[PDB]
Design a protein around this ligand. Structure first.
Ligand SMILES: Nc1ncnc2c1ncn2[C@@H]1O[C@H](COP(=O)(O)OP(=O)(O)OP(=O)(O)O)[C@@H](O)[C@H]1O
Ligand SMILES: Nc1ncnc2c1ncn2[C@@H]1O[C@H](COP(=O)(O)OP(=O)(O)O)[C@@H](O)[C@H]1O
Ligand SMILES: [Mg+2]
Ligand SMILES: [Mg+2]
Lengths: 191, 331, 340, 191
């Protein structure tokens, strides 16, 4: 069950859930598989925080094993479009979309806990139909694979030939390895 | 009554005040009309025009008094600067409201000729805000209406121009409420976290309604058809003011060192940094005093300790707070 | 003395532009009110009760102007006391007594003048629905119908307090009841939403054209006003919104028209102030969007005149200053005949 | 869980869900498969906002993989009937029915994010019965197909023959491609 929290503001006492209280501090949580419904909540949260303070930074915690590519793109495109710098902090796992959203944070604001694990693999897809339909969908999944590799290269600075080579198979990277790779900037250890 | 043209009024006043020329433009024509119009109305067709009272709203150390003084520096007619806190109930609990007319009797020289063109000015009118309080406002408003009342010497109250100016505390927050906020979208114009934080919310655009919301008597709030808007300060104007007065801060600092026989050498470069310190403390022109007073404390405790200290050179590092006064002590 | 209602209407019409409905109501209202103060003979006819009016109109409609202008026709003490300041006894805030107190200050502490005074309590809508609500209404109820004054002495014991009965004074009440249009919309054709609905024309100064024409006591009670309070005020006047057609007819027609006043000041220097038909209309539209109406004309005009009002005196031989529609907006500057 | 939000208005503080708070700004969200239940909410929301301000524009975000044709028609017909302009900002994906709503927005107010995929496909129908019923149910799915082609040609401006040719098979169009096609007006990247 979600616990309740009391802010105890000067005007008076208010009761907010644990998640809503943190949202007041420009914090957004990404938990579970990425899908259209949960992804829409993140988009709404990002826009709302923008209006409250378009200058203050935002912190997006990412703990997900991946999910829908389209849902993830709606978040990534929203993070870059808005004015505030959306920080990113890995809290243990990012398989396919978690690393794209972890590496799509403002420069100097991508963190990772000491024992977090980050992976990167090519987008998986499933479709059935006629040969003509298969050829059409095959080109679409090949186009997406290229656009995703371009995003990582831009934020990480590595050449596209290396990204494509590393995304052919599942590649696990620790906190220290990710810094050299360019996925993140700093590894938070202690306060 | 001096009564020059708006051009002359603004130009002659600019000589002593820098940065307040925007408001000047409005006030220039404003007072110009009042004297000319009333004095020689010649029974104008469908006379409706009421006394052209102008409001003055600016923060502390904005040069309200300076603009009031410069306005009264060349004005031959009296100005009778007065206060709003000093006023109390009408001789019941303390000072009466006829004391404003009493200050006019001193300046007018007991001359009815001067009294009728008396530019009754008040300062810090924002200290009688309703929450004595509202009672003084009503007893004050009575004279604004132009009700002939002796103090004892009969005084002409008609045609008395009011340029009263108060440092209203919490004025921007009230006009900030009137301002609308941005939306929350992908194709919407979020303009800012807050709206009265980039420009002075109060002194850019004001309507009588905003004043009534502040907590002032609506009759007095709608008694002045004209208004003004004072700009707190300017970065460019802060370097000129540093040595513009006859006894400017920097000048006085050197003069104080000269009493002992030391020259206060100062660098142009340092000036720029100094302006920023004042702009950050946001305490007005008077605020700058504290910055240098502290900075000089070390120099006010080093020059005395070492005698024969010919001069002292201040560099940008000294205002940064790293360098120590470069004592030029020699022979 | 007791001028015919028609004469009052014509005099008030000089400034007010298009308030005929309320004009007549306000005219008859005062006319009979002062007839009571006049008809004081002892013929079993002193029982006559006063009938207070309840002016409802969108902000800037002209409510205050009517009250102020009419006050001059009476040539007796008049005052305007906001309703927000007043708060029930037992908590900090203005006391109902204070209303009489300030009212008497304008009267010079004359009992005869006091009884023959008119009040214009504003923002009555604010006090709708434990504190600042029914409490204030309950206190005010007695005051408006019948009450003795307790105004403390001015300048200079507790017995010094003066008294006067609040049973003659006509307590007019003006208020911009925000939302009343929806209450009156519920009377007939309640539909707000839907394809076959009465969806509001717009969110500009067109919405309340004649929406208050069908105002009944029931709606005012539903609004929040106490039933007794609504009963106290039998007459309910209604004002228009002063839309663009009104604002065009208000910038030159009134005797105190801004153009006239501005022209007078300009005429002194020798410049013949001129305005274009479309130019005046342009200002009206700008005021409506700004939501400042009446009060926005002066400011808007000052932003278009003051600029050249600081130049014109220094310029000589000036004969005319043509104000074009373009000049009103921020595209052009006032055309002026620099030479003859 | 849906996080709560406080407006902190002058009148007082009220708690609004993340979706309700945006609704006050004339914003409607269309997520998931199109169906009668979800589509009816959009209808009520569009009509409700019309009364508050029939002049202010409305922003309808579309992220949906398609659904019921009848449910979608109620939305499109409602958007055109009302006076306010209904802006469209496609985030994520916009399939056959989603693309129709994206194209139904006001002129010059149709948008899409950079990594947005807009697909167009024929209407999907299924029915079983006698030959007479099949013939009757075949004209309806064919007549509907003509109406949808006319709608796209009207907004996009392309000739009807091109719409039928493109709708025969799945065609994925990016932001830039959709602008040339007329489906949208501008591709927004950064504020
Ligand atoms: N516009 C200005 N130009 C030059 N100096 C100024 C200006 N405004 C303030 N000052 C400086 O402020 C000092 C005097 O402050 P003063 O007592 O006039 O504050 P004030 O503006 O009257 O305060 P308030 O606005 O509350 O009445 C002088 O040393 C003067 O140099
Ligand atoms: N028809 C009109 N002619 C001239 N002035 C008007 C007219 N209508 C409103 N005003 C101006 O609008 C101001 C506001 O008063 P009013 O409209 O009565 O109510 P409120 O003060 O609540 O806006 C008045 O000072 C008046 O000069
Ligand atoms: Mg001073
Ligand atoms: Mg008014």
């Amino acid at each position: 069950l979600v616990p309740m929290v009391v802010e105890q503001s000067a005007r008076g006492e208010r009761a907010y859930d644990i998640y809503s209280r943190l949202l007041k501090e420009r914090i957004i949580f990404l938990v579970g598989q990425v899908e259209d419904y949960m992804a829409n909540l993140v988009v709404a949260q990002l826009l709302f925080l923008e209006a409250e303070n378009p200058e203050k930074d935002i912190h997006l915690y990412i703990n997900s094993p991946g999910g829908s590519v389209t849902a993830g793109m709606s978040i990534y495109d929203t993070m870059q479009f808005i004015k505030p710098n959306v920080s990113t902090t890995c809290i243990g796992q990012a398989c396919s979309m978690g690393a794209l959203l972890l590496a799509g944070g403002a420069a100097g604001k991508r963190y990772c806990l000491p024992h977090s694990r980050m992976m990167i693999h090519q987008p998986l897809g499933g479709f059935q139909g006629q040969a003509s339909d298969i050829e059409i969908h095959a080109k679409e999944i090949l186009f997406i694979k290229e656009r995703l590799n371009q995003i990582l290269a831009h934020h990480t600075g590595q050449p596209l030939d290396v990204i494509a080579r590393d995304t052919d198979r599942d590649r696990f990277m620790s906190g220290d390895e990710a810094v050299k790779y360019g996925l993140i900037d700093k590894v938070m250890t202690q306060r | 009554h001096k009564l020059p043209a708006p051009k002359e009024i603004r130009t002659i006043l600019d000589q002593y005040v820098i940065g307040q020329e925007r408001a000047k433009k409005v006030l220039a024509v404003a007072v110009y009309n009042h004297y000319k119009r009333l004095n020689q109305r010649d029974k104008k067709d469908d006379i409706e025009l009421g006394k052209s009272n102008i409001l003055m709203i600016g923060p502390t150390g904005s040069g309200k008094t300076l603009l009031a003084e410069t306005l009264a520096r060349l004005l031959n007619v009296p100005f009778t600067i007065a206060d709003a806190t000093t006023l109390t109930e009408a001789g019941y609990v303390g000072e009466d409201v006829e004391n404003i007319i009493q200050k006019l009797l001193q300046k007018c020289d007991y001359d009815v000729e001067k009294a009728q063109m008396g530019i009754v000015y008040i300062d810090e009118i924002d200290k009688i805000s309703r929450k004595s309080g509202e009672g003084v406002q009503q007893a004050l408003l009575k004279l604004i209406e132009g009700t002939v009342a002796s103090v004892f010497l009969q005084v002409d109250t008609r045609n008395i121009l009011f340029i009263c100016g108060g440092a209203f505390a919490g004025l921007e927050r009230v006009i900030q409420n009137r301002s609308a906020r941005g939306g929350i979208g992908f194709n919407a114009e979020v303009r800012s976290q807050e709206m009265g934080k980039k420009v002075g919310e109060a002194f850019k655009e004001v309507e009588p309604e905003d004043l009534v919301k502040f907590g002032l008597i609506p009759e007095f709030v709608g008694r002045l058809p004209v208004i003004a808007t004072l700009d707190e300060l300017d970065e460019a104007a802060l370097m000129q003011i540093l040595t513009e007065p006859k006894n400017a801060l920097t000048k006085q600092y050197a003069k104080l060192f000269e009493m002992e026989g030391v020259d206060l050498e100062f660098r142009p470069d340092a000036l720029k940094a100094v302006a920023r310190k004042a702009l950050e403390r946001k305490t007005g022109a008077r605020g700058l005093r504290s910055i240098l007073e502290g900075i000089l404390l070390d120099t006010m405790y080093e020059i005395p300790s070492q005698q024969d200290v010919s001069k002292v050179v201040i560099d940008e590092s000294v205002i940064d707070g790293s360098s120590q006064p470069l004592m030029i002590y020699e022979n």
